[PDB]
Ligand binder design. Sequence first.
Ligand SMILES: Cc1cc(C)nc(-n2c(=O)c3c(C)c([C@H](O)C4[C@H](O)CCC[C@H]4O)ccc3n(C)c2=O)n1
Ligand SMILES: Cc1cc(C)nc(-n2c(=O)c3c(C)c([C@H](O)C4[C@H](O)CCC[C@H]4O)ccc3n(C)c2=O)n1
Ligand SMILES: [Co+2]
Ligand SMILES: [Co+2]
Lengths: 382, 382
Amino acid sequence: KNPKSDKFKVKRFHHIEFWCGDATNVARRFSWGLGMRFSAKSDLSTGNMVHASYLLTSGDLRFLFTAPYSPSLSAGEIKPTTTASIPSFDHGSCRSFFSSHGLGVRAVAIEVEDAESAFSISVANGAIPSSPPIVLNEAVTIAEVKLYGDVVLRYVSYKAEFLPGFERVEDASSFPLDYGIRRLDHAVGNVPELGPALTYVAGFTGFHQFAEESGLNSAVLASNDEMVLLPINEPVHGTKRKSQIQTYLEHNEGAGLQHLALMSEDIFRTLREMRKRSSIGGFDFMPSPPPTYYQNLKKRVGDVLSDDQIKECEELGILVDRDDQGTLLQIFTKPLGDRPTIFIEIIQRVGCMMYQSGGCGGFGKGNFSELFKSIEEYEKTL
Amino acid sequence: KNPKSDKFKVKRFHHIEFWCGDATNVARRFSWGLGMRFSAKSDLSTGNMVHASYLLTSGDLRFLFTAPYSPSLSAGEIKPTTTASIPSFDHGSCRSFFSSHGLGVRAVAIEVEDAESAFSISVANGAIPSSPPIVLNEAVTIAEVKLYGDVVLRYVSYKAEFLPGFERVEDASSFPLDYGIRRLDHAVGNVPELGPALTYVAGFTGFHQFAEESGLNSAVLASNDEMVLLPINEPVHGTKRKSQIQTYLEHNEGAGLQHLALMSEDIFRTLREMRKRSSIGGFDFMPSPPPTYYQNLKKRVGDVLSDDQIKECEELGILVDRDDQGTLLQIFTKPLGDRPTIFIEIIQRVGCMMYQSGGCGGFGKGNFSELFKSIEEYEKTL
Ligand SMILES: Cc1cc(C)nc(-n2c(=O)c3c(C)c([C@H](O)C4[C@H](O)CCC[C@H]4O)ccc3n(C)c2=O)n1
Ligand SMILES: Cc1cc(C)nc(-n2c(=O)c3c(C)c([C@H](O)C4[C@H](O)CCC[C@H]4O)ccc3n(C)c2=O)n1
Ligand SMILES: [Co+2]
Ligand SMILES: [Co+2]
């Protein structure tokens, strides 16, 4: 069931903004590790005395990395005279976020039909305002409401190239890296209590519940065409192994974004390229499932994947799940930074052709049982 | 003249510590960009609840990257019960340093015969104490005094593997990168007033002055065998072009470390490898001198470098200077992070064979005039 109850017209995920201590070093690391090109900038060289912001892109995926300069460079400015290209930016909010949470996602940005109306309707329906609608160069409108913790849901709408005040990046600095990642599939929050978090967010968006012992409860909120997908997790206490959601909350100092799932047009090539770079500046992946997991794939998805394609999943540590509608290939990175908090998921979906409907195959919930069983079978085998 | 007036026995540069917002991302970026291997760690996986510290090495060059965790993880600790592996670390000092200065060098560490005696003699001779001598596992002693700004001169001495509490890094995480960098040649501070800075540092070390219109005055302090080299710069005001030292002080919020000069055993190979990676996660270099500069090298160092070796300098943007004792090959990176503050110099020295004496060829002061003249000649040519 999809009641299509969005209270305002939502299009697609637009970008993700990380708040950083040094945007240059995080952006260069992510660019090499994920195969994302340097696409735009707003910094001292573009007249921005307030913050350094660098945009990486791969297909439709947009990762923004932002850090504050010394407040002294902009001390004579006021908001009417600001040189910041992102008017919601605040030195104090950014420093406090990073000191509290470490490196992580400040903004989950979605493109909407009209950011001013989305902001008003959201707030009229319970959203806590964070930054009011601001029109940039009579061209782009941006507004922000609280999502969970210190993460904001950012609305952006365009009259008709990222944002005014950003400059497109010089070719020599723009190496055309590409490992096959094409768009953001979903963005996942960890919270202490799932119920109130869902009620808040579904309350002000109209997003509906998407139909779907290991330490979490989770549910997924979705827009009308189910292309904006926002899962939310809560911990389950008193288990044998401590909940990874609770470990997140402790190290993150509370709720925040847990993982970003990036859709690849070729998850085999993406993982080959990412794994080649894991130990030379890139990202590391979680430990691979045992061979028993891959023997069990024949019975589960042997009608979807060939023996060679299953063996390729085994070589790359790829996990596989399946819905009543489709099939899911997924893998998780180790944490992106110092703290055991945010990580990345790489994903590719098979099925649900109509274009492919959003969330085809689910989110991998079936792999909690399949991993456990396969680990037990492997332990008993040896 | 070398009076050999060190007040305590100094050996060599030991390491450089960067204070970071996220140590993981800076260390991975530096590793790929400079060809430095992941050598040791002290973090949550080693029992450190206080800070994440990662060590990169190339030859004798040691770069340490350190960031604080949430204070809540260590809130029940006291200094007698600390899990920090670096006892001078303080969450508040680190957060304040980074918020004030951005990414940069907190500690210039030198290996001494006895860190407790070096600390006592330094303080008895005017050094401002920063962290008292602390003996780690009855094996290593560490102590810190202020150098300039918020940069400390760290003393380390060994009874007889980086520091106790650090673990050597697993092979799979340790990719054996190497672009030829072998040791730290010198470390340079920017200060508002050179005179008092020199008098302070030379006062408590006994380091002597090393014998050597463009916006700076500078002088170099050196240990007895002149293998520890600490240049210090001050701005010169009222010039045509604004002093780069003054721009540093403004963006850094005061004095701090300006550049680290890394000696390569093969500066041609180092620059080839670094430039291949500039736009895929590595470091960018300053704009190359005009061809007139390289035509002028024949008259200056044609007895030192062949035509092919001069043409190789031209291909790589390498600068060349010469002493009465030796010849200097050098090049500078763009700033390492968001702010136009710290950068890196790659260097290789020819001559002064006895081993090679420290500082052979000077520090490139002759290239201020040579660059200007060659730019004027190139402008007139076109
Ligand atoms: C090393 C380690 C330690 C622990 C405690 N769990 C794991 N782990 C996962 O984190 C994991 C995740 C994050 C997902 C989804 O992506 C999420 C969806 O987007 C939203 C719905 C629920 C979310 O879980 C799916 C399966 C997972 N499976 C099987 C798993 O085993 N891995
Ligand atoms: C783009 C740009 C803009 C400006 C204002 N200056 C430059 N520049 C330099 O920064 C530069 C530096 C940093 C050095 C040494 O390494 C230092 C020694 O270690 C200590 C003694 C003095 C120190 O200068 C040598 C020559 C330099 N030359 C010729 C130059 O032109 N480059
Ligand atoms: Co997921
Ligand atoms: Co130098």
